[PDB]
Design a protein around this nucleic acid. Structure first.
Ligand SMILES: COc1ccc2cc3[n+](cc2c1OC)CCc1cc2c(cc1-3)OCO2
Ligand SMILES: COc1ccc2cc3[n+](cc2c1OC)CCc1cc2c(cc1-3)OCO2
Lengths: 277, 277
DNA sequence: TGACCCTCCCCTTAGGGGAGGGTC
DNA sequence: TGACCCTCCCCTTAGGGGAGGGTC
């Protein structure tokens, strides 16, 4: 080859845009063999095309352009290692993505269950699978004064283990024949976990526990301050009428229907309590 | 909560940077409940913190910010679907990454073999594993006039199946007792394939074939115009002396030692030919 | 008085999309 | 004369890093 290739020829031959070529030129990653001193036209030698091989390959695997500059120097000996490195990072993304995929699936699983609920406002008994959770004591907190900010530390944990943040906010309280909401006080407030991934060094003011597998007398409904208590009451009554034996605290889960700052807020509330007979 | 949270409080509570908060404000993704008309200070209500849940989660899975805006509207019903979509894309990246990982491994495999070669300039017989390749006829092309551009269409194929571009350039020619390089003419020029991934609708001027598994009389060495022919000669002589039977064309593979535009170019050349006894 | 917060401005990857103007 | 090529400029994700200046 005693000639030269014009920018467009190289582009058609290497399947690399002219824009890409001008950029690799500016970047001093791949500069033409000769630039016409007048027209400023870019000209390339055939032997030089070989350098685009590495460039295109590294680009395919996401290597940053400036990163390539150092790679084009090493001589097959170290280039080997360079790849072993790239492999490590590739597996990194894979593990992340696999985990992420699993998480999403679980969020959907739980999400579907709330969508296929028997009936709102009515009490019923069903067999539940255990649900793992992270809890901390309520410290006086009760139905009338809980805040989203109250779940801050809990959420920081689930977040650094799941990436995803809890979908539901939970609380518990002694099963009593209350006559008023102000008589109520939460024992614990909790958030369920998704990934059981070893919780990054948990502090002792948190407990990794579970809402055990068993039979539960439940009731779900769309939140309304004047319905919260009356629904608790249905539950209390239902258990008394069938003479059931409660063997856990009442478990309370609040999950938002939407996260739109536009529409009026609405939550799904679910109270369940483990029973025996 | 009859008060407000200052930007920094929300930041500490939601584990979201103040910068991030100001940006989500500008973007109209998450704006404070109230902005002090004088100080311009940003103030947030506790109930509002709940909207950051979706934001943080979608952000964790790579959803673009403007994309989130539409997601915060849908009500759990469609939000479910939205995730099914996200799952599809997640698997997409996974397949890609898995493939990519496999590719890199192969490039390393081949790369290592060239690094652990018996001896340069000397002829020897070894048992080889089959190597799949894509070839096209040489059309007169020979050792003295092959160009990188000659492998253009071939490379466009391997590239759209492997992402990675071939590491070695190949050619073949009839095994003859040549007396001169100018007597030589390639039958085919080829590039080996990495992924056997169904080659995207291959045109008939290309053949998907293979350098079969078998015994080969080989010789590798660092390229030098005056060594190309003399090494071919060693091969021709070696086969004559042991009275071996050649049962293929001579296979020629050229692979660059580096892709640095700084240092002098250097290639690794390997000639092999399948024999019988 | 210190932390706390605000606006403004500059910077970052790898180019794609033109626009205005010469050029094999 | 048309394609081919060049330089210049604007634009793109999600903010982080200050800088200069008021503020619970
Ligand atoms: C976003 O999370 C929320 C959002 C809103 C919530 C609203 C209420 N609770 C938790 C909430 C919660 O818990 C996590 C506790 C039970 C309750 C009783 C009431 C009432 C409001 C509430 O008005 C008077 O009687
Ligand atoms: C980057 O790829 C290259 C680079 C350089 C190459 C150089 C030569 N060949 C292929 C090459 C190739 O093939 C793909 C064919 C054999 C040959 C005989 C010769 C000679 C040069 C070459 O000088 C006189 O005798």
């Amino acid at each position: 080859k005693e000639s030269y290739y014009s920018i467009g020829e190289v582009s058609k031959l290497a399947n690399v845009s002219i824009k890409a070529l001008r950029y690799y030129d500016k970047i001093d990653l791949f500069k033409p063999a000769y630039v016409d001193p007048d027209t400023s036209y870019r000209y390339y030698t055939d032997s030089q095309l070989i350098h685009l091989d590495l460039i295109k390959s590294l680009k395919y695997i996401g290597t940053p352009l400036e990163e390539m500059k150092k790679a084009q120097d090493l001589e097959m000996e170290e280039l080997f290692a360079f790849y072993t490195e790239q492999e490590r990072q590739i597996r990194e993304k894979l593990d992340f993505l696999s985990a992420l995929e699993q998480t999403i699936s679980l969020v959907k699983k739980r999400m579907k269950r709330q969508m296929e609920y028997p009936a709102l406002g009515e009490v019923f008994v069903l067999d539940e699978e255990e649900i793992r959770i992270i809890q901390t004591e309520a410290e006086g907190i009760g139905p009338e004064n809980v805040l989203n900010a109250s779940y801050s530390k809990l959420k920081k944990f689930i977040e650094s283990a799941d990436g995803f943040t809890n979908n539901s906010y939970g609380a518990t309280f002694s099963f009593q024949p209350y006559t008023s909401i102000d008589e109520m006080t939460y024992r614990h407030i909790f958030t369920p976990v998704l990934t059981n991934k070893q919780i990054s060094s948990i502090t002792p003011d948190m407990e990794i526990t579970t809402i055990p597998k068993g039979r539960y007398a439940c009731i779900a409904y769309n939140f309304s301050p004047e319905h919260y208590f009356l629904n608790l009451q249905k539950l209390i009554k239902y258990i008394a009428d069938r003479q059931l034996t409660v063997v856990s605290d009442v478990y309370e889960l609040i999950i938002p229907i939407h996260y739109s700052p536009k529409k009026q807020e609405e939550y799904r509330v679910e109270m369940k309590i483990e029973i025996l007979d």
